[PDB]
Amino acid sequence: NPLEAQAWALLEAVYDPELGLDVVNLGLIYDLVVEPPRAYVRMTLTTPGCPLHDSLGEAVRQALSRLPGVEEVEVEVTFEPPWTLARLSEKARRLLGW
């Protein structure tokens, strides 16, 4: 499903403002399912508590809505499990310096 690869590439352009890294390499994407006309993503945030405006979740929704055949995007934001820097990818660790 090349659509899935397309989805990841799109998400890799969405950045967390506090850490300056994309949501994929930060390890914020917990699940991703793309089955036209629907796209589903389960993700978390880098800090606890629901913000008044989930700008990151909105950016992810907008990114996935660009997928061909996708007319509805469900973005589920959860804290289960809770995120920590241990979820950073190998690439992210290179970009950081680690």
Between CA 71 and CA 38 the distance in angstroms is 6
- Binding its own copies (rule: CB under 8 A), the pick from 5, 9, 33, 50 is 50
- Regarding 11 and contact with its own copies (CB under 8 A), the answer is no
- Regarding 52 and contact with its own copies (CB under 8 A), the answer is yes
For 80, phi and psi rounded to 5 degrees?
Answer: -125, 105
Which residue number, 52 or 86, has a Cβ lying nearer to Mg ion?
Answer: 86
Residues lying near Mg ion in the complex (CB under 5 A) are found at 84, 86
Stretch that binds its own copies, among 12-20, 23-31, 45-53, 87-95 (CB under 8 A): 45-53
Q: Which two tokens stand for residue 53?
A: 């405006």
Which residue number, 4 or 18, has a Cβ lying nearer to its own copies?
Answer: 18
Partner whose footprint covers residue 84, from its own copies, Mg ion, none (CB < 5 to 8 Å by kind): Mg ion
Q: Who's near 37: CB < 8 A, 6+ residues apart?
A: 69, 70, 71, 72
| CA 98 to centroid of chain Cα atoms | 22
Between CA 76 and CA 69 the distance in angstroms is 20
- Regarding 57 and contact with its own copies (CB under 8 A), the answer is yes
- Regarding 76 and contact with its own copies (CB under 8 A), the answer is yes
